Design a protein around this motif. Structure first.
Motif, PDB file in Angstrom:
ATOM      1  N   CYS A 155     -83.539  94.602 -21.161  1.00 38.58           N
ATOM      2  CA  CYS A 155     -84.569  93.567 -21.025  1.00 38.58           C
ATOM      3  C   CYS A 155     -86.019  93.981 -21.266  1.00 38.58           C
ATOM      4  CB  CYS A 155     -84.530  92.996 -19.584  1.00 38.58           C
ATOM      5  SG  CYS A 155     -82.900  92.683 -18.899  1.00 38.58           S
ATOM      6  N   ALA A 156     -86.363  95.213 -20.871  1.00 33.92           N
ATOM      7  CA  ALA A 156     -87.730  95.673 -20.988  1.00 33.92           C
ATOM      8  C   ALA A 156     -88.389  95.558 -22.359  1.00 33.92           C
ATOM      9  CB  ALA A 156     -87.804  97.089 -20.505  1.00 33.92           C
ATOM     10  N   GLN A 157     -87.607  95.654 -23.426  1.00 32.14           N
ATOM     11  CA  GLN A 157     -88.177  95.541 -24.754  1.00 32.14           C
ATOM     12  C   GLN A 157     -88.854  94.184 -24.937  1.00 32.14           C
ATOM     13  OE1 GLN A 157     -85.053  96.487 -23.702  1.00 32.14           O
ATOM     14  NE2 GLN A 157     -83.604  96.171 -25.416  1.00 32.14           N
ATOM     15  N   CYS A 158     -88.463  93.201 -24.134  1.00 32.83           N
ATOM     16  CA  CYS A 158     -89.039  91.865 -24.286  1.00 32.83           C
ATOM     17  C   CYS A 158     -89.698  91.323 -23.045  1.00 32.83           C
ATOM     18  CB  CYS A 158     -87.968  90.863 -24.705  1.00 32.83           C
ATOM     19  SG  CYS A 158     -87.170  91.316 -26.243  1.00 32.83           S
ATOM     20  N   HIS A 159     -89.693  92.079 -21.946  1.00 31.67           N
ATOM     21  CA  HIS A 159     -90.227  91.568 -20.691  1.00 31.67           C
ATOM     22  C   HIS A 159     -90.831  92.625 -19.789  1.00 31.67           C
ATOM     23  CE1 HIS A 159     -88.318  87.537 -20.769  1.00 31.67           C
ATOM     24  NE2 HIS A 159     -87.198  88.106 -21.184  1.00 31.67           N
ATOM     25  N   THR A 160     -91.860  92.201 -19.055  1.00 34.09           N
ATOM     26  CA  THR A 160     -92.461  93.004 -18.000  1.00 34.09           C
ATOM     27  C   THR A 160     -92.152  92.215 -16.708  1.00 34.09           C
ATOM     28  OG1 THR A 160     -94.631  91.889 -18.178  1.00 34.09           O
ATOM     29  CG2 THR A 160     -94.283  93.994 -19.449  1.00 34.09           C
ATOM     30  N   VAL A 161     -92.226  92.893 -15.564  1.00 35.16           N
ATOM     31  CA  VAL A 161     -91.969  92.244 -14.279  1.00 35.16           C
ATOM     32  C   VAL A 161     -93.160  92.261 -13.322  1.00 35.16           C
ATOM     33  CG1 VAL A 161     -89.448  92.548 -14.177  1.00 35.16           C
ATOM     34  CG2 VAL A 161     -91.005  94.383 -13.378  1.00 35.16           C
ATOM     35  N   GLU A 162     -94.090  93.202 -13.488  1.00 38.97           N
ATOM     36  CA  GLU A 162     -95.197  93.315 -12.531  1.00 38.97           C
ATOM     37  C   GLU A 162     -96.214  92.186 -12.542  1.00 38.97           C
ATOM     38  OE1 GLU A 162     -97.478  96.682 -15.405  1.00 38.97           O
ATOM     39  OE2 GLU A 162     -97.063  97.162 -13.308  1.00 38.97           O
ATOM     40  N   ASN A 163     -96.925  92.048 -11.422  1.00 35.34           N
ATOM     41  CA  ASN A 163     -97.992  91.036 -11.278  1.00 35.34           C
ATOM     42  C   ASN A 163     -99.113  91.381 -12.275  1.00 35.34           C
ATOM     43  OD1 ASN A 163     -99.820  89.120 -10.347  1.00 35.34           O
ATOM     44  ND2 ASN A 163    -100.021  90.025  -8.308  1.00 35.34           N
ATOM     45  N   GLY A 164     -99.443  90.452 -13.170  1.00 34.96           N
ATOM     46  CA  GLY A 164    -100.477  90.685 -14.163  1.00 34.96           C
ATOM     47  C   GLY A 164     -99.923  91.310 -15.429  1.00 34.96           C
ATOM     48  N   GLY A 165     -98.621  91.618 -15.398  1.00 36.44           N
ATOM     49  CA  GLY A 165     -97.953  92.232 -16.531  1.00 36.44           C
ATOM     50  C   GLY A 165     -98.089  91.421 -17.790  1.00 36.44           C
ATOM     51  N   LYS A 166     -98.009  92.086 -18.934  1.00 35.17           N
ATOM     52  CA  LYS A 166     -98.191  91.361 -20.165  1.00 35.17           C
ATOM     53  C   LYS A 166     -96.956  90.663 -20.685  1.00 35.17           C
ATOM     54  CE  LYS A 166     -97.261  95.019 -23.616  1.00 35.17           C
ATOM     55  NZ  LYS A 166     -97.747  96.037 -24.608  1.00 35.17           N
ATOM     56  N   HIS A 167     -97.208  89.620 -21.464  1.00 34.49           N
ATOM     57  CA  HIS A 167     -96.128  88.931 -22.137  1.00 34.49           C
ATOM     58  C   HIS A 167     -95.886  89.797 -23.384  1.00 34.49           C
ATOM     59  CE1 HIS A 167     -96.722  85.573 -19.555  1.00 34.49           C
ATOM     60  NE2 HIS A 167     -97.748  85.036 -20.199  1.00 34.49           N
ATOM     61  N   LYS A 168     -94.624  90.074 -23.656  1.00 39.81           N
ATOM     62  CA  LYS A 168     -94.207  90.794 -24.841  1.00 39.81           C
ATOM     63  C   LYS A 168     -93.487  89.702 -25.697  1.00 39.81           C
ATOM     64  CE  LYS A 168     -92.680  95.025 -24.326  1.00 39.81           C
ATOM     65  NZ  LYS A 168     -91.946  96.229 -23.880  1.00 39.81           N
ATOM     66  N   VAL A 169     -92.291  89.975 -26.224  1.00 42.30           N
ATOM     67  CA  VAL A 169     -91.582  88.969 -26.994  1.00 42.30           C
ATOM     68  C   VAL A 169     -91.362  87.776 -26.063  1.00 42.30           C
ATOM     69  CG1 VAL A 169     -89.434  88.388 -28.191  1.00 42.30           C
ATOM     70  CG2 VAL A 169     -90.374  90.686 -28.433  1.00 42.30           C
TER      71      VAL A 169
END
Ligand code: COH
Length: 103
Positions: free
Chosen positions: A14-28
């Motif tokens: 999942c990480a290649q397309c998603h972050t989980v942290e507060n303020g984390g960036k949008h990727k794919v």
């Protein structure tokens, strides 16, 4: 579920397309902070397909487990291109990690 096992699954699948942290960036795909208890397609500032915005259900253990098994079946028209985590146990450990890491 097992948070440590779910974490490794998340980093691998999942990480290649998603972050989980507060303020984390949008990727794919969208950052997932605050996912639980929220309706589909509500991450701030992410441009979702109309399908992900309109599904209309609330994300929780029950709905994420169904969705992650087969994303496109649950949200036809989604632009999240991923086949799903087919094993129930792997999916449950991943949901445990998501619950822990997104709040
Ligand atoms: C190749 C890209 C990719 C992969 C591998 C992937 C792998 C995974 C993954 C691994 C098992 C997990 C836990 C998730 C979890 C999610 N993804 Co993606 N996602 C991805 C691209 C996306 C995109 C893009 C969206 C938005 C779909 C839309 O708008 O139709 C998305 C949406 C979602 C949503 C719905 C968010 C919301 O309604 O706010 C969840 C939950 N996810 N994803």
């Amino acid at each position: 579920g097992d948070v440590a096992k779910g974490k490794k699954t998340f980093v691998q699948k999942c990480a290649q397309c998603h972050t989980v942290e507060n303020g984390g960036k949008h990727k794919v795909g969208p950052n997932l902070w605050g996912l639980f208890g929220r309706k589909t397609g509500q991450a701030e500032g992410y441009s979702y397909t109309d399908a992900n915005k309109s599904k209309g259900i609330v994300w929780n253990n029950d709905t994420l487990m169904e969705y992650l098994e087969n994303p496109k079946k649950y949200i036809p028209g989604t632009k999240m291109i991923f086949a799903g985590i087919k094993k129930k146990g792997e999916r449950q450990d991943l949901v445990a990690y998501l619950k822990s890491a997104t709040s």
